[PDB]
Design a protein around this ligand. Structure first.
Ligand SMILES: *[C@@H]1O[C@H](CO)[C@@H](O[C@@H]2O[C@H](CO)[C@@H](O)[C@H](O)[C@H]2NC(C)=O)[C@H](O)[C@H]1NC(C)=O
Ligand SMILES: *[C@@H]1O[C@H](CO)[C@@H](O)[C@H](O)[C@H]1NC(C)=O
Ligand SMILES: [Ca+2]
Lengths: 55, 465, 165
């Protein structure tokens, strides 16, 4: 939003999001253990998002 | 298994200009294979079959020189081998008095010396090679046909080389070095963490040394693998193509040297990949045999650390102490409740201002005790979330060692100790807030004491009225 | 922001970009003004009408960035999301009072800006079970409340040493 709204550069942002909000986002709990407990396979998902940003 | 390695044959050297690659296995250069394929080339015609006689003798002489030079590098190779066997086995290192960094230092020195003996004696071998393939250049300048001769031997040798390329298994080597590389880089990272974790550095020194040697083996295996794949791909690139029937002498010479160089690279390559495969699997077995000695000590650190982190005995001190204060508060409170219930009915509205003082302090009493109850409820709530963290770690810790696969077990123990390292960040805040509520309990204990003393002097007052 | 660990990860990433052999790797630095905690704990308390005795709720680990350093007493009104639509359908007047909202649907700064526009005096923000199902009810979180972006003490011009601050 500062890039697009301020400087006038076309900007993009994308997430593999879930229907409900991610519960502990700016909290003290957010760590790799609760992450990999939440998303059971992480390497394929981040593999896909890195593939999109490569494209 | 065995703590030491049998074959020391993976060490190698090439010339400084990168023009010639040597090896430890027979016949230590690829261009000898090029001279054997050139020898069946020389058996194909007559003008060059006089030369298959001649360089039969010559290449045999060069083979004797290379074998003798490798013999001198055998009597150096034992001097390297002893320094390997000191470093790989921990108790064999524990017998001597010499420290680790000095023995690794002399190991580097003797490795450079061994590599030096193969280098220099093979330099004299390379002077012999330049004489030989110079006379090979004289052969394909010696041929009687200037542009008469055909391309039939070339395409036939495309066919023979193509079937031999169809013979060899490439994909299992490829997937093999991918799997072994992935396990290797994972091993380097987990040894890097576990170095800072564990206490005893002897085993971790031997492991780290074997990691270095394994990395050297992996790089050699990649070099021979990529060279084999490039050779087969270039031969299929020749196997595409537009076919000529008539050739001049100079270009046919370049074609023959090209394809002969290619299959020579191949037949050297599969042998090098074979030996590197075998010794590589042996070193993998050694690193298994060391990590198996490590994980029992690692489990002792985990069991020590779980009691340390989650702040448990201090917490139970806070909870039992706070419930003790609640018990004393209800005890002295009820002990005065009978006299208070007499004191409220006693005055008969005789006094007003001090009655206002009384029901001030009474409401302060009741609301204070209920506030103590809500405080204790909060403390026990934060504590049960903290214990829920701990029992999540223990419930993982039960199902970790049931797997038993001798290399991932260290990784799961490192994963769980990494999980307590994650959990500290939030557990600290829980314990902090429990300390704050206990400070509140102390202040309310002071208030309930002075209020009860006030009520005692108050009943003395209304008894005076 | 600006802690020592951030500089360790910083020199780690710059060390990586140097190691990947990019065509040019370069570093820039600024000097900004942020909002951090102090020694005195910020807290929230039920005050009785009598004022005789004091009840603690918690000493929360979280803090909101760019809040005003103050202390307020007053009544508390639930203000579901603080959206303008959610303020227009509100039963009670909002002036001279503290609002409590639950986290979601908009940034913190638009909640504080809207409740400031209807002349409230303070904002408490939580997260609850229906939107955020978490096992423990004890963890605390972080947010900034600056409407708009940027270093707020240099609007429009950059925060270098050249601009004299
Ligand atoms: C650039 O501006 C910064 C302002 O952040 C100056 O750094 C501060 O200077 C004051 C006065 O000497 C001291 O508090 C510290 O030396 C600096 N503060 C911090 C937090 O680092 C700085 O001197 C200016 N000039 C240069 C050349 O950097
Ligand atoms: C809000 O403050 C007081 C208290 O409710 C009230 O009298 C006043 O009219 C309200 N509005 C403004 C703009 O002050
Ligand atoms: Ca700015």
């Amino acid at each position: 939003f500062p890039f697009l709204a301020y400087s006038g550069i076309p900007a993009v942002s994308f997430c593999f999001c879930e229907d409900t909000d991610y519960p502990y986002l700016g909290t003290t709990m957010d760590t790799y253990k609760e992450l990999i407990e939440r998303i059971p396979e992480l390497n394929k998902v981040a593999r896909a998002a890195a593939e999109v940003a490569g494209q | 298994s065995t703590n030491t390695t049998d074959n020391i044959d993976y060490f190698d050297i090439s010339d400084e200009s990168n023009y010639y690659l040597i090896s430890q296995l027979r016949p230590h250069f690829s261009n000898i294979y090029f001279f054997d394929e050139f020898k069946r080339y020389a058996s194909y015609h007559t003008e060059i079959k006089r030369y298959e006689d001649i360089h039969k003798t010559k290449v045999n002489s060069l083979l004797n020189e290379a074998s003798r030079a490798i013999g001198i590098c055998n009597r150096a190779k034992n001097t390297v081998k002893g320094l390997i066997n000191i470093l790989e086995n921990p108790q064999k290192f524990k017998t001597q008095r010499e420290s680790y960094d000095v023995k690794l230092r002399q190991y580097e020195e003797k490795k450079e010396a061994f590599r030096g003996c193969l280098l220099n004696k093979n330099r004299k071998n390379l002077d012999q090679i330049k004489k030989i393939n110079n006379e090979i250049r004289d052969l394909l300048e010696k041929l009687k046909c200037s542009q008469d001769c055909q391309t039939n031997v070339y395409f036939d040798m495309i066919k023979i080389y193509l079937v031999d390329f169809k013979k060899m298994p490439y994909e299992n080597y490829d997937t093999f070095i991918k799997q072994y590389k992935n396990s290797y880089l994972s091993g380097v990272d987990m040894i890097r963490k576990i170095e800072k974790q564990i206490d005893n550095p002897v085993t971790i020194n031997a492991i780290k040394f074997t990691q270095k040697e394994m990395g050297y083996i992996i790089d050699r295996f990649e070099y021979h693998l990529q060279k084999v794949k490039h050779s087969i791909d270039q031969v299929t690139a020749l196997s595409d193509g537009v076919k000529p029937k008539q050739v001049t002498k100079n270009r046919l010479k370049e074609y023959y040297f090209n394809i002969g160089n290619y299959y020579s690279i191949f037949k050297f390559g599969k042998d090098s990949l074979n030996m590197l495969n075998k010794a590589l699997i042996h070193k993998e077995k050694i690193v298994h045999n060391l990590l198996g000695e490590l994980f029992g000590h690692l489990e002792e650190r985990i069991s020590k650390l779980i009691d340390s982190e989650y702040f448990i005995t201090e917490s139970n001190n806070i909870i039992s102490q706070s419930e003790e204060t609640l018990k004393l508060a209800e005890d002295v409170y009820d002990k005065n409740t009978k006299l208070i219930e007499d004191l409220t009915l006693y005055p008969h509205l005789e006094i007003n201002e001090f009655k206002k003082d009384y029901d001030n302090n009474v409401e302060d009493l009741r609301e204070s005790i209920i506030y103590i109850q809500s405080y204790v409820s909060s403390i026990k709530s934060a504590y049960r979330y903290n214990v829920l963290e701990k029992d999540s770690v223990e419930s993982k810790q039960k199902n970790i060692p049931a797997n038993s696969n001798a290399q991932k077990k260290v990784d799961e123990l490192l994963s769980i100790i990494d999980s307590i390292s994650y959990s500290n960040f939030s557990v600290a805040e829980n314990f902090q807030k429990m300390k704050d509520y206990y400070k509140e309990i102390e202040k309310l204990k002071i208030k309930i004491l002075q209020l009860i003393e006030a009520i005692k002097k108050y009943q003395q007052h209304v008894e005076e009225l | 922001a600006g802690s020592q660990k951030d500089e360790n990860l910083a020199l780690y990433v710059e060390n990586q970009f140097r190691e990947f052999k990019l065509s040019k790797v370069w570093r820039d630095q600024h000097f900004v003004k942020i909002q951090v905690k102090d020694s005195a704990q910020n807290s929230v308390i039920i005050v009785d009408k009598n004022g005789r005795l004091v009840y603690l709720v918690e000493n929360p680990g979280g803090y909101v960035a760019y809040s005003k350093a103050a202390t307020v007493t007053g009544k508390l009104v639930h203000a579901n999301f603080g959206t303008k639509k959610d303020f227009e359908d509100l039963y009670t007047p909002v002036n001279g009072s503290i609002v409590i909202v639950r986290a979601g649907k908009i940034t913190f700064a638009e909640k504080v800006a809207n409740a400031e526009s209807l002349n409230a005096i303070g904002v408490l923000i939580y997260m609850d079970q229906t939107k955020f199902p978490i096992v423990n009810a004890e963890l605390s979180f972080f947010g900034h409340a600056h409407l708009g972006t940027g270093d707020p003490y240099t609007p429009g011009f950059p925060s270098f040493n050249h601009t004299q601050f």
